[PDB]
Every structure is written in C-alpha cells, then in structure tokens.
A paper describes a structure:
Sterile alpha motif and HD domain containing protein 1 (SAMHD1) is a dNTP triphosphohydrolase enzyme that catalyzes the hydrolysis of dNTPs into triphosphate and 2′-deoxynucleoside. In terminally differentiated myeloid lineage cells and resting T-cells, SAMHD1 activity reduces the dNTP pool to a level that inhibits the replication of HIV-16−8 and other retroviruses as well as some DNA viruses. It comprises an N-terminal nuclear localization signal, a sterile alpha motif (SAM) domain, and an HD phosphohydrolase domain25 containing the active site. The active form of SAMHD1 is a homotetramer where sequences N- and C-terminal to the HD domain stabilize intersubunit protein–protein interactions and incorporate four pairs of allosteric nucleotide-binding sites, AL1 and AL2, that regulate the enzyme through combined binding of G-based (AL1) and deoxynucleoside (AL2) triphosphates. The allosteric regulation of SAMHD1 has been studied extensively.
To further investigate this preference, we cocrystallized the catalytic domain, residues 109–626, of a catalytically inactive H215A SAMHD1 mutant44 with Rp-dGTPαS and magnesium ions. The structure of this H215A-SAMHD1(109–626)-Rp-dGTPαS–Mg complex was determined by molecular replacement to 2.3 Å resolution and contains two SAMHD1 tetramers in the asymmetric unit with electron density for nucleotides and metal ions found in each of the allosteric and active sites. The H215A-SAMHD1(109–626)-Rp-dGTPαS crystal structure contains a Rp-dGTPαS substrate bound at the active site, as well as in allosteric sites AL1 and AL2. In this structure, the active site Rp-dGTPαS coordinates the His/Asp-bound Fe, two Mg ions (Mg2 and Mg3), and hydrating water molecules. Several amino acids also interact with or pack against the guanine base, 2′-deoxyribose and thio-substituted triphosphate, including Gln149, Arg164, His210, Lys312, Tyr315, Arg366, and Tyr374. Although Ala215, that replaces histidine in the H215A mutant, cannot provide the general acid required for catalysis of the substrate Rp-dGTPαS, an Fe/Mg3-bridged water, W0, that could act as a nucleophile for catalysis is positioned in line with the scissile Pα–O5′ phosphoester bond of the substrate Rp-dGTPαS. This suggests that the Rp-dGTPαS substrate conformation in the active site is representative of the precatalytic state and is consistent with our enzymological data, which demonstrates that the Rp-dNTPαS diastereomers are substrates, albeit with a small reduction in kcat relative to canonical dNTPs. In the Rp-dGTPαS structure, the Fe is coordinated by the α-phosphorothioate sulfur rather than the phosphate oxygen present in a canonical dNTP substrate. Here, it is apparent that AL1 selectivity for Rp-dGTPαS results from the α-phosphate O2A oxygen of the AL1-bound nucleotide that coordinates the AL1-AL2-bridging magnesium ion (Mg1).
Residue numbers in the entry:
A (entry chain C): 113 to 275, 284 to 485, 489 to 582
B (entry chain D): 114 to 276, 284 to 462, 467 to 486, 491 to 579
C (entry chain B): 114 to 276, 285 to 462, 467 to 485, 491 to 582
D (entry chain A): 113 to 276, 284 to 462, 467 to 581
C-alpha cells in the first residue's frame, strides 16, 4: 500500500498517505461524489457542478498543510505523524453528513420534515464516520500506521463537531490542533479556505483571500494556559477581508434569489414525496427521506439521486412531488416580488417563519386578492459566523518583535471603515401565482407589509 | 427578454429569448446529469463538469465566431436568423450523449447492440426533433423570424452533416456557416474550443490554445467556388499546436489508464443490468438501457442516474451489475497488465480477449477475464494531416486563399498523424491471476509481432 | 491599417490606425519608462509594469464601454468619431505622470515647488497638446473624420474635467464624460484597468468583474442629462469595487516600506534638483521640478533620472546619490509608529518640526518623516454610491437612486479616514528608541490615538 | 537578521534565509531590476515589462523547492541546509551576467562589437558573483550560517557555468544531482526553464502548458553510471517532450518574433554607433565602453537598459547617429522585413551574409542598387537545446515497481507523433531602407541569394 497522488484544480498535486486512501475508498466517502456543494446554486451558476467529494479532499489536504507548517516552524510543539494523520482524516471526513443538495437538506428540509429533532450535517458526519470505520475494518489499518483508535477516533470526531478543558482526544498542550478543520473559537479554518477557492473557481467569481499567506504567518502561542494558533498582527486587515469575502459570496451566489427559490421548490417536492419514498437501511428496514438520517446504511444511499428518482417516477402517489420538479425543468419557478430588511436590532426568530405569509396576505394596501398559500417568505441570516459578534475580537495575534506573546487587536485599531454590525437579516418574498395581474398585486401586499412592520422601503 | 448566464470559462453569456425556450426543456436540462468526461471524474476529481455547461459554451462560441465574421465582412450577408440557427446548433449539438458520455457510444452500445450503427450525433438530431415537437418550439421560432422547415434542417445538418452541393438548409454562398459548430473539412470548430478550455479548467491542466485570437484572425474566402472559413497564414503554427494540445489531453486525461478501466467497468455493469432495467418511454412502453436510444422520451430519462439506480438496487437479478459498481466504490478495480503498439480495426475489437486467452506461454484464464482496450491517437482525420485541409490568407491579399504545406512551417512537426495503443487489463485481481495475465499478454504480443 | 496588441489583462486589443499614430510618438512611448506603482516595485517584485501598458488598457476599455452602449442603445447616436475620441482620451489620460508615478505629484512636486498647484492630469493635457502639435496629428485626425478643434477639447475635458460646463460635446452626450474619468462618482474604466493589472502583477487577486458591469450599463435621463446608469442588482458590487480599491491601498499602494522607498527617492530628487539639467524647447535648461513647465523637457524626464543619479560621479550629486545607494543596500529609513486622528496638505511640511518639538540623544526635524495617508472612497467624506444612478429590469429608462440602508447594514458607516506614519532617518538602537518617544508625546499633544 | 518573505505573482510567498537577503541587497544584484527579461520583446508584447531580478528570485525559490523535495523524499541522499543554501544562491545568481536587453547583449552586440572574445552571460554571472562577494563582505556572512566559502563559492560557480573522471570540485559524485537543478548540462531540464516559462507566459499573455510542480513531486534520485542523478517517473516522459515543445513554441511566437528581433537589431545598431563615445567608470576611475565594460565588473554594474535612455536623451553631436536610430524606434519607423527561408549556417559566417545578399545579381530588374550595410541577415536556430540531439535520450527514468533502478526510454516507446528532427534553422532578411522602391529591390536580392545557395524558395 503506497501513497496516491490526486490532481485537483484548486490545490494541484495532493499527496494521500495509504491510510487516507483506505478511508476514501469506501461507499460512505465515495457517496460525496453525488451531492453538489452548492445545491440549487447549480441551476443559476452552471459552473457550480462541483460535489462535496472534491471539497472534502481539499480540506484534508489543507488541514495537512497547516499542521505540517506549524510542525516545521515550531518543533517544540511535538506534533507527531499521528497528529498529522488525525487532522487530515478529520478534514477528509468533516462533510460526510451532508444530505441531498447540501445546505438545503439541513437548512430547509429537515427542520420542516422533522421539527422535533435538532440535526446538523456535522452530527451526521460523526455518525457516518463511525459507520465508515466500523463497516470497512479501518481500526486495524489505523493501528498499522501508528494511530491509537480509542483516543484518535474521539479526537477526529471532536475536530468535526466539537467536544475546565472539555476535550478527551488530545490534551491542552495540543489545543491548537482543534482550530484547523473546524475552528470553534472564531471560524477561521481550512474548510472555509477550501470552499472559497473551489466555489469561486466554479462559480466564475474571483477569490480575494490568500490562504497560503495566512498559513506562512501562523504560529502557536500560549493564550490563557492553552497553546492556540495565532495570526501575525499585520494580517488583521486580511482577516476582516476574509469574512467580507464570505459575506460577499453569500450575497452573490449562495443566497441568490433564484437559487433559494429552487432550493425551496426542491424542499417542497421532498416534503410531498416523503411519505411515499422508501430507502433501504440495515436489516432491510425501510426509511423515508426524513428518517434516513437515523440509519447510516440508508443514509449512505440518500444523495442528489433522490431528485431524479422523483422526477423520473410514474407512481401516482408521487404526482404532486414530481410536478414540482417538472416545473423546475420547465423553469416555471415561483416569482420574486421584493426584498427587505428589519430596521430593529431584533431579528425575526425561526418560531415566526410559518406565520409570515399570513402577515403579508393581511396587508391592506386592487384587481386580484391573494392568500397566504400564494406567498413564500424566505428569511436569510447574514453574519460573520458568530451571530452579532465580531469574530476578529476572538483572534489571537503576535508581533515580529515578540513572536511568543499573544495579543488582541480591537476594531478601532484597524480601521474606521469596517462594519459597525456583524449580523443582519434579509427577507425575500415570492409569489406562486405567476401571471401579470397576480405579480402586480403581490408587490402591493409586499410594500404595505413592509410599511406595516417599519421595515426598509424596498428598491 | 435576454437572459445572462455566468460561466467560469466564458464569463457573461447572453442568451436570446428563443435560446432560453430551447434550454428550458427536459430534453436540454437532461444534460445537467451527464458528466463531460465520464469515468475521468474517478481519476481527476475536478472533472465534475456536465454536458449542459459545455453545451451552453458551444452555443456562446458558435455565436461569437458567426458574429465576428459578420462584423468584419458585411458582404457575407449573415442574418440575425443565421446567427440564431448557428447558436441553436451549438446549444443542441451534444443532446445525444448518453450516460458517462464517450463511454456510451464508444463502448456500451457497440457491445450491447452490435447490429446498429449509433453515434451521439445521430442522437442529438433525434433528441433535437423530440425537443422541438414536444415543447411547441416551432411557433416560437417563427415569432423571432426563423423559417422552421429550412432552419430545423439547417440546424440538424450542422450537427451531423448532410441528410454536387449536398446541403439543403443553406446554399453554397453560406457554406462557411457549416464549419462553425462541427467542421467536417478539418475539425477546427468552436466545439473543440469549448472543451479544451472547460476540460482544462476542471482537470487542473493548462490550456495552450487561444481561441479568442483565432476568431479575431478568421476570414471567409472563396475556395473552389465555395465560401469557406480561412485562417491568417501567421496562425498556422498555432493550429498545429491546437491538435498537439488535443492529443496531449487524450494522453494525460481522456485515455487515462484508470479512467478507461472505470468506463470499462461501468460498461460491464450496464451489460449485466441491461436485461433487467426498465426505462419508461412513449405511451408507457418499456425500454432497456441499450434500446432507449430508439425512443427519445425514454432516452430523456437515461442519464448518469442509471449508475446509482443500479448501485442502490436490492433486486437479486441486478446483483451481478450492482457488485461491479460496488467494486468501483471500494476501488477494487480491474488491473492493468501492460501496453503495446502495432492498425487494429473496430471489426476486430470483440475477438481480442479471445486472442489473448489463446496465447500459449512456455491458473489458466478465460476470454471473459481480459479487457483489450484499443486506443486510436490521431489528429482527427485518421492518417491525414488536418492542416493540409485548412485554407489561409495573407495580410496583403485577404481574399486570396492559399495552402501552407508542412515543410513550410517547421521540420520539428510530427512525421505521422495517427497511431494506435493497445492496453490489456485483467478482471481477476489476485497475485497469481495478474502474474498469469501478464504471461498471456507478452506471448500474445510476440504472436502478433507487436512491440 | 489596424494593429493588434496582445495584453495579458485584456487579450487581443484592436487599435485603429489613428490610435497607432498617437501611440508611435516619443510623448506616448515615454510611458514605457515610468513604473505604474513606483516604489511599490521594491516591495512587490512583480510590479514591474509601466504606465504604457495601463494606458493601452484604458484605451481598450474606454472603447468597450462606448461600443457596448452604442450597440445596446442606437438612439444615443454614438458615432465612430465619438468612439475614437473616447479611446484617444483613454490612451492619453496618464501622459502627465512623472518619475515613479504617484510619488512625483503626491510627494516631490509639492515639496520642491510649494507655490504651484500641479496634478499629473494637468500634465496629461499639456503633454497631449505637445504630442499633437509636434507629430502633425491634426491633419491625421481630419483624415479619419475627427474635427480637431472640437475633438481635442473633448479629449482634454475627458482627462481633466472642464478647463453645462463642457464645450467638446453637448448635454445629450454627457455620458461620454463618465467613461475615462468619472467626476460624478469615480466609477470609470481607468480604475478597472489598474485593479486588474496591478493585481495580475502584484500577485493579489482582483474581486471586481468589470466585464459584468459593462454588460449591465445603460444610459438614462437624469436631471435633463443623459448619464450612465448601473443595473440596480449591481449596487452591492459597486460598494465592493471601492472596498477592493481601499484594500489594494492597504496592502500594496500604501505599504509601509513602499512609501518609505518613495520618500527616499523623493529625498534624493530634492537634493539632486538644483544640479540636474534637462534640455527643453529652444535649448533652455530645466530642473527635475521645473521640467513640468516645458513638455519637451518633460518628455525626457522618466524613471531614468533615478539611474542617472545613481550612476553619476559628479560631486554635486553626491548627497542624492548616497540616498539612492542606501536604497540598493537596503539601509532604509525606519518605521517608528502609526496613529490616527483630518490633517490637511497645507500642514504636511510642518509636521516633522512638530514631532521634534515634543518634550517627553536629542533629534531634529530633518531626522523625521511624517507620512499622512488618506483612505477613502474617492470623494473625501462622501459615499460615492449616493452619486450613482440605477435602472430596474421592469423600466430600463427610469433612473433611480438606491440609499445605503437599502443595500446592507454591514457596510461602512464612514467613507474616509486618515493614517499618520512616522519614520526616522537615524537608524541605530539609541536613535530609534528616542524617535519613538518623540512620536508618542506628539500623539498625546495632538489628541491622536495612543499607538499600537 | 531574520527571514524575509517576498510575494511573487508566479510563485506566491517566497521565503528567503538571511544569507540570501544579504546577497540580494547589493548593487550587483539589484542591477537586475534594470534589465528586461525579454529585451526588445517588450516593444511587441507590452505585458513583457518583467526584469531579470524577478526571474532570478524565482529561480532561487524553485532551486530550493526541488532540492528540499528530494531531501524530504530521500533522507539517504544526506542533503544538508548547506547544500540547500548553495543551490538557492546559485539560482539567485545564475543570471547576474546579463547585459542591457538580455539576449540582445550576448547574442547580438558583443559578437559584433568584439569578434575576438568569446563571451556568454554565464561567464559574466561568475565574474559578477565574484565581484558581489568580494565587494560586499559576504564571505564572513557565509561562514556565520555554516557555509565553507572556498568549497561553496566553487560549487555555486560550477552550478552556473559548469566545471572551471569527475570534473567538479565543489561537491563529490554522490551529490552530482545538485548540479542538475539550476543549470542542467546533461539535458537542459532545470528550474531556470521552469521559472521563465511561467513568468514569460504570465506577462506575454500566452498560456503555459508545463506543470513544473508535477515534475518535482515525481522526481527521485537514482544511481546512473556510478553517479547519483535526478530521475523522472517513467509516466512523465510525454510531459518532458511537451516541455521542449512549449519552449520551441515560445520561441516561435514571442522570443523570435520578427519585430522583436528587428528592434533588438536596431538597439544593437545604436549601441555600435554609440560605443566609441560612451564612457563608463570602472575600478580605479578607468573608463570603459559599452563593449569593454564586460572586462570590469564595477563598470558592468552600472551597464543596464539605462544606456538606451542615456543615448536617446543625449544632446552630444557625436551620438547623433546612435540617437537617430533610437528615435526611429519610438516613431516606429523600423527596419523592414523582406523575407524568410530555410537551409546549417555557422556563427563564423553570420558577419559575411549581408555582403552575400548584396552580391546577388538578379535577372536585370533594378531601379536602386543596394549595399551590404543596408541588409540585416538574422540566423535563427530552433532546437531542443542540444543542437541535433534529442534531450530525452539523455534523461533517466524510474518505474513504480523499482524506484531505485534508473532506465532509458527511447522515442519509439513514447509515440510515433513526436518530431523526427530536433533542430532547424531559419534565415530572415531585413532592409534598413524602408521606401517602396528599396524594399522591392531588397526582395529581388533576397530571392536570387536564396537561389544561389539552394535554400527553399521563400
Ligand atoms: N496535471 C496532470 N498532468 C498529467 O499529465 C496527469 N496525468 C495524470 N494526472 C492526474 C490523475 C490523478 O489525479 C493524479 C495521479 O495520476 P497518475 O496517472 S501519476 O497516477 P496512477 O495512474 O495512479 O499511476 P501509477 O499507479 O502508475 O503511479 O494525477 C495528471 N495531472
Ligand atoms: N432560464 C434558465 N435556464 C437555465 O438552465 C439556467 N441556468 C442558469 N440560469 C441563470 C440565468 C438567469 O438569469 C438566472 C435565474 O433564472 P431566471 O432568470 S429563469 O429567474 P427569475 O430571474 O426569477 O425570472 P425572470 O428573469 O424570468 O423574471 O439563472 C438559467 N436560466
Ligand atoms: N460574476 C457575477 N457576479 C455577480 O454578482 C452575479 N450575480 C449573479 N450572477 C450570475 C448568476 C447567473 O448565471 C447570471 C445572471 O444572474 P442575475 O442575478 S444578473 O440574474 P437574474 O437573477 O435572472 O435577475 P433579473 O431577473 O432581475 O435580471 O449571473 C453573477 N455573476
Ligand atoms: N497571444 C499571442 N499568441 C501568439 O501566437 C502571438 N504572436 C504574436 N503575438 C502578439 C504580438 C503583438 O502584441 C500582437 C500582434 O502580433 P503579430 O505577430 S499577429 O503581428 P505583426 O507582427 O504586426 O504581423 P503583421 O504585420 O503581418 O500583422 O500579438 C501573439 N500573441
Ligand atoms: N505606489 C503607489 N503609491 C500611492 O500612493 C499611489 N496612489 C495611487 N497609486 C497607483 C495605483 C494605480 O495603479 C494608479 C492609480 O492612479 P491613476 O492615475 S491610473 O488613477 P487615479 O484617478 O489617480 O485613481 P483613483 O481614481 O482610483 O483615485 O497609481 C499609487 N501607487
Ligand atoms: N499577497 C499579498 N497580500 C498582502 O496583503 C500583502 N501585503 C504585503 N505583501 C507582500 C509584500 C512583500 O512581497 C511580502 C512581505 O511583505 P510584508 O508587508 S509581510 O513584510 P514587511 O513589511 O517586511 O513587514 P515585517 O518586516 O513587519 O514582517 O508580501 C502582500 N502580498
Ligand atoms: N527577446 C528575446 N529574444 C531571444 O532571442 C531570446 N532568447 C532567449 N530569451 C529570453 C527567454 C527567457 O526569458 C530567457 C532565456 O534565457 P536564460 O538566460 S533565463 O536561460 P537559457 O539557459 O538561455 O535558456 P535555455 O536553457 O532554455 O536555452 O531569455 C530571448 N528573448
Ligand atoms: Fe466543509
Ligand atoms: Fe461538444
Ligand atoms: Fe490611469
Ligand atoms: Fe535564467
Ligand atoms: Mg461542514
Ligand atoms: Mg464552519
Ligand atoms: Mg459531440
Ligand atoms: Mg468534432
Ligand atoms: Mg491618472
Ligand atoms: Mg480617478
Ligand atoms: Mg542564464
């Protein structure tokens, strides 16, 4: 068993250790070839055909670069081949839990199909990782290459989903290893760096963030009795620009008005198909689209394929679901009516989403009257990854003249031209009735609703 | 109105409303579910791109080249109608591709149905006919000034060639319109230009060919009482490099040893699934993977999805097909045994595993255990130099077409323009079987005086 | 005929024969010998690009935008003549740059000649006049359908603004004045070329899609004037354009060391100024600081002046040559600190004296550099986007305004700030320590932010 | 003294050890900022403003990557920090000898100005490296960071120019491979090529087909003829034929562009007319000419592309002839291409060719008769870097199944679509008299000359 090399358009030649190859060459990992990174984004940006598989390889590769680089610069950290392998495995496996159309699945479908459960694709990744290990005899292969499976499986999981020192996989003196793949402190992790580059390459938008530079300048210093990753103070401006780029990719691509409408329609189709579709899990037991998340053998076979299974079906019980997807192909989509924003420092909460179409329909501003069933109200939260908080206040820096002393850099020390808030909310309204007289009316309800709630007058 | 689409290769592509109506059909949107490079994606993870994107790009580039000839030479009398027809042909030229693209017409259909002669291009014509007829496109064409009887014929002829001037869609004085999307004279067409750029972008290999430059320098001149596209004489070196790039993309990516083995395995899985899978066509009639090419309503639903349908199946009659695809996920692939060089004709492909298995070198193995992959590497015209079939003009006389021979360009160019490679693989992957398979292979090579 | 030029930023650029005649003059070819980013090249080794390349690119982009407005809206009655004039203005808009570009009009001339008010744009107009008059271009213009009196005025007005305030073109072609140098809001093709080109060469990636902006640009009536309007959808991308510009200033153009190198070159030029002779019209001799008064002399004033000084043996140039030798050895002046308030151009000269008078080795005003850096959105305290007109899909001739609250609550609350950096010319341990003490006391004395 | 980081558009963040910084921050190195990589190419391809300085940093960086990567993959090679520093210094300094407008200077000007001497920019690089060391107190700085200057200076020089039975003194046979990184004498596959392909492409606006990063990942060291050499993975053989293809392709389109070469010829003409009147101050205040400054590195230090502008901006009447030639470049009244043809003609015969053309007696046309001074005859050699030889026959490969056994791969084992020849020669003729009647005549002399020497009808 040797090294394999994989050519990636974002990263070039990626070297994979034989243990990583064994993990990649499983049904649980190869599944990611059949789930698009950007979901309904592909129906607006035709370049965005990229799947989670490619992304996952890239996060494994970048997880490895950052840990290797900290190791070469600071030998006193005593970063081991074992540490490197575990960090790479976590990068490779961090997105195993994604479902059909990625963000659509955990952002839209599961909260509507199963309001009782709290599910994240990250929880899924842990469960799918457990299934992958156990059903492909990976524990002995790990031992062969010097890993200790009890400690290291825990470590890999904790890197994906998170956990007085709360972690068991590695002690405080390797705390920094937990900032690479998924950074809970501030969000600055290699996962972001891969998706910015990859999404850009494919969308046809250009990426402003130099991850290779950030890596060269990263050191480990002591902060609050913990060894953490610190950035060179000089790079502070570039980190505010990293979040700016992320928010900019959300505005243009990920929350595109039509991409979101297509995700909403697919979600609608899935909800109508949910009672009739059967996915075979462990012991031949049958699961639904919404329950396959409870059985990883079933979940393994739940991919973007589900879209085509519904579209190509002839069963009359799937007629409603299939008609929604047929309307996507013909491009008879629901129609955008307008966008607006809360002026209040209080955002609209998930509890209130269901009641919004009713509120719009009750606006008393007309030819055609319209009903709550005719409106979609899409509520979009845009932030810097920590609700109302500035992520950069949670970043540690060093200076050239004292590279072991960690410091904080406040927002006033960087620039007066930076954002005064780090979270905002956008509300888009669409209409399901698409003729001239209905759209005109829908727009009237929308503007009056905006006046009724002291929201921003629309464009 | 117009719609704008952002593409990573071409930037902002403007689509006329008629083109939008054609794109927004099930027959076109189907191309979202067929990978450009098929099994290449299982070697080059960037190659997730599908035929849909490519098809938009050929529509766009077909439009650039025809617009540019029109602006430079108004005397050609290129009409908005001509432009729309050329764009529609670029959009629709790849409608006939099946699951995993080249795999489908290169490997599967010739094995599943040896009696028929099928190309994805014939498929594109049939799928175009189905698309028109089932989406009420003829009246939309008339609305924007096309004449459907003439123009549908013209669009088809652009895709597949004619159906002693052989064409009906357009007369001799617009002959050049037939060289844009699919060039039968020499292969220099916008379809190549899109795939070089797109495949490169995604594979992670860099493209040496500047199509935008070629377009700026393209003119139409009279050659043998026919108006054809000519290249600026200065560009001759760049055209030899275009074919060099194509052949280079075949060596590294398209005929990758493992990419081809994965295509062979998928093909194997399809042959074992063929008798048991049902695809619903017109009037509810059922078709097989290999027969869906006879019914375009069925064919519409035959995409890369078929791979997952087989993989996720529980039916025992699909166990054999499903096990082959499961071995792809585990990466227990068929194993490369060796490569060699003579040409061997398509007529002989089926009989080659038998020939290998009959080698008696100084575990025995059977013909079912060997794959013999015959790979033709050329400049798109068998043994011929495509550039001998290119017309050029000079700066000082831009209407006089000329030929440029190979000795006038460089003594460092290829002496031949076609060669053939034969690879052998084994389906039995253990130590003792591979060793044997290698012995059969070398003795076979000695038996046929190959390298 | 036409010539084609391959550019790494724009691909194949087509040049009409009249534009070739303008390019093939000493006054234009001069721009091959002036670096776009000046002292930036001594920090970012990719930034070897010169103003010539940039100038071709602005000519090309000026042409794309005007051609595209013409194809989309024939009712504008944009003529081949209008197109040629806009292209010529793009080609010639940067003719006035001096040695090391921004250094020359930002730093050297205000110090060498405080009495005069000079911009490279005024220079471009004068150099354009010289180019025309000394290369017999007026009859060549007439040959290809221009009307030189009207059109020369038009080209100049495109570069520098008015000299309805315009004479070269009436109100119904107002929009032609927004292409090369946009006085209303700063959104012009000149920005677009430098973002792309600077990025390509610096090794930083450009976030702004100029080709997209062009596809979406229309002309609509605003206040009885036909202006360029952007598609409403693009408002977010325009805030990001200014964000990108400001980002290129933070990282590259105002790099601490790039600015120190510009300051050192400026210092060398000030010491060489009285001893250099550049031959102008009538054989009259000009200095580096006076060559801006005579375009024949100015023609021969390029980055070459740096090497002339560096390679000299003349004792009168010893002081200037020693400063430039210290740049090669990399014995640069040393950064002491940064701070923030605004300080006006009138006050720049007096600042080293103010620092040296701070009472916290003693040090003197000649020992300090005080570099005042203005970071804004190109209109001082103003939001440029409040001065942009937009159209909607549903009514593409109705122009509208879009306020900042309609776009995003995550946008800047301010559009201008000022940074002050201090450096010391005396580089030993004891001097730097002292220099830092003067600096912090000065900051306390003027109620500036205690330094990082 | 620490590390410095430099951002390069081709290579990204380049790390430079303090010793390398000391070498870079000298007048002898910084000089390369004032010499364009592609010379007269910039007057055809406006993107090609790049100078030798940037290139030189890039070769230092790539020299370092390749040696570091061989070291990480094969610890048994015993590659030292010292070996790495020496290879990097050689990459940084390999182009120190270039003169004004790069190839123009050693290809055209010096062979015409000083036919007696044999000069290459590489000899210059060695001499300039010696001057750089000696005049900037670098020997002690080298010792500070663990180099041994007598051995290591020799090693660095030998890497640049070749040796000065195992011919090398700087390093023994077991580190032979270190000599293949910067300038490969065996086959030409070196990091110097890799930097210029990428950089030239980036700037010219032509796209690069060669993946140097891939080549590096696949490079190993194996034993060949009792010597440890760099070997390529057998699978990469096709990509190496494509590397030479790309080089030859960059020569056809950019480096030997008809007008780029004419501009180099005009600059050379201007330099020859200025050579007697320009004075460059060298060591001890002794004065050198443009053509003699190559004999004194203190003078040579101040000889850059600046010399072009010094001549252009001059007012001295003795420089009027030289200055008028350069003024004609700005106005674009260039010398005019008359024609091209193909046979080889040897360097010994270049000088005599304009005379041969002018002696052609064409069947009695001729308004204007023309003289040898009126013709330029440009002889252009297009090859794979080894005259008539296939460089790939001089490459060693390994297989996956035996990565320590080196092998050869013949051309028939790779492809029947590869070149049958690896060298050809082009002859271009130009005329200095540019009016309609002169060009027509010049073309008549040219075709008769071609008939007289049995060359291809043009
Ligand atoms: N950029 C690039 N150029 C190429 O020429 C090329 N060829 C392949 N690849 C990509 C495809 C893959 O992403 C990666 C590995 O390809 P490889 O062909 S070295 O590997 P194995 O077939 O496994 O050969 P073995 O088993 O004998 O070592 O490089 C390439 N990528
Ligand atoms: N029509 C279409 N087909 C595709 O296959 C496709 N792929 C990407 N895009 C891009 C191009 C489109 O601009 C974008 C959104 O689709 P749209 O325009 S239909 O939907 P709204 O804007 O809500 O409706 P309208 O303009 O009719 O009022 O997606 C596409 N658009
Ligand atoms: N490069 C780029 N930057 C962007 O900011 C951007 N925004 C969208 N796209 C891509 C996505 C598509 O491929 C294309 C069109 O997206 P569009 O937002 S203009 O259009 P419709 O939604 O149809 O809006 P309407 O109906 O009001 O005209 O550009 C973009 N592409
Ligand atoms: N991208 C690119 N590829 C190339 O192969 C190439 N060759 C040249 N150029 C660049 C160099 C220039 O920037 C431009 C045109 O050079 P050109 O060789 S078409 O033309 P003239 O010398 O003018 O030949 P004539 O007088 O017969 O037209 O393209 C090229 N640019
Ligand atoms: N090195 C350097 N220091 C500086 O302080 C500086 N300031 C500008 N530049 C460089 C960066 C660019 O390459 C160029 C910008 O100047 P141009 O004359 S093409 O246009 P404007 O109308 O001045 O710019 P805008 O409208 O955005 O204010 O000069 C600078 N470069
Ligand atoms: N790509 C990129 N992004 C940037 O934001 C950027 N900023 C600078 N550079 C380039 C400029 C140089 O090529 C390189 C390092 O510049 P640096 O600003 S880290 O370094 P010193 O000023 O020497 O500061 P110290 O001594 O305090 O570490 O990166 C940059 N390159
Ligand atoms: N303008 C121009 N004309 C030319 O004839 C020419 N020839 C080379 N160059 C440019 C092209 C490159 O930028 C560089 C090549 O010369 P270098 O000193 S970096 O290395 P070598 O060892 O000579 O190259 P190799 O080993 O491949 O034969 O000079 C040229 N540039
Ligand atoms: Fe991820
Ligand atoms: Fe195609
Ligand atoms: Fe400018
Ligand atoms: Fe070199
Ligand atoms: Mg995730
Ligand atoms: Mg995250
Ligand atoms: Mg096809
Ligand atoms: Mg074809
Ligand atoms: Mg300017
Ligand atoms: Mg401006
Ligand atoms: Mg060299």
């Amino acid at each position: 068993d040797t090294m394999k090399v994989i050519n990636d358009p974002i990263h070039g030649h990626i070297e994979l250790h034989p243990l990583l190859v064994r993990i990649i060459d499983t049904p649980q990992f190869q599944r990611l070839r059949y789930i698009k990174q950007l979901g309904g984004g592909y129906y607006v940006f035709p370049g965005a055909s990229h799947n989670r598989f490619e992304h996952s390889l890239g996060v494994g590769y970048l997880a490895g670069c950052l840990v290797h680089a900290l190791g070469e610069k600071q030998p006193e950290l005593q970063i081991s081949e074992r540490d490197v392998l575990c960090v790479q495995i976590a990068g490779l496996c961090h997105d195993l839990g994604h479902g059909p159309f990625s963000a659509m699945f955990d952002g839209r479908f599961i909260p509507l199909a199963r309001p009782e459960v709290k599910w994240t694709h990250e929880q899924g990744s842990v469960m799918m990782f457990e299934h992958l290990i156990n059903s492909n005899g990976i524990k002995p292969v790990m031992e062969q290459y010097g890993l200790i499976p009890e400690e290291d499986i825990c470590f890999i999981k904790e890197q994906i989903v998170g956990p007085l020192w709360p972690y068991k996989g590695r002690p405080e003196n390797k705390s920094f290893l937990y900032e690479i793949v998924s950074n809970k402190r501030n969000g600055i992790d290699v996962d972001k760096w891969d998706y910015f580059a990859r999404d850009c390459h494919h969308l046809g938008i250009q990426n402003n963030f130099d991850y290779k530079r950030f890596i060269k300048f990263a050191r480990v210093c002591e902060v609050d009795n913990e060894l953490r990753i610190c950035a060179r103070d000089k790079e502070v401006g570039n980190l505010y620009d990293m979040f700016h780029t992320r928010n900019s990719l959300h505005r243009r691509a990920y929350q595109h008005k039509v991409g979101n409408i297509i995700d909403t329609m697919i979600t609608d189709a899935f909800l109508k198909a949910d009672d009739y579709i059967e996915i075979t899990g462990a012991g031949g037991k049958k699961y639904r689209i919404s329950t396959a998340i409870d059985d990883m053998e079933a979940y393994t076979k739940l991919t973007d394929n589900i879209f085509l299974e519904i579209l190509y079906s002839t069963d009359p019980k799937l007629k409603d679901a299939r008609e929604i997807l047929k309307q996507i192909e013909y491009r008879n989509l629901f129609k955008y009516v307008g966008e607006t924003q809360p002026t209040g420092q209080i955002k609209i909460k998930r509890e209130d989403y269901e009641s919004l179409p009713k509120e719009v329909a009750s606006a008393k501003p007309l030819d055609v009257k319209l009903k709550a069933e005719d409106f979609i109200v899409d509520v979009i939260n845009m932030d810097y990854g920590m609700q109302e908080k500035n992520p950069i206040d949670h970043v540690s820096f060093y200076c050239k003249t004292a590279p072991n002393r960690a410091i904080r850099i406040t927002k006033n020390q960087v620039s007066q031209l930076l954002p005064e808030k780090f979270a905002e909310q956008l509300i888009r309204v669409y209409c399901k009735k698409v003729d001239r007289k209905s759209l005109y009316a829908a727009r009237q309800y929308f503007v009056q609703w905006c006046a009724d709630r002291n929201f921003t007058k629309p464009q």
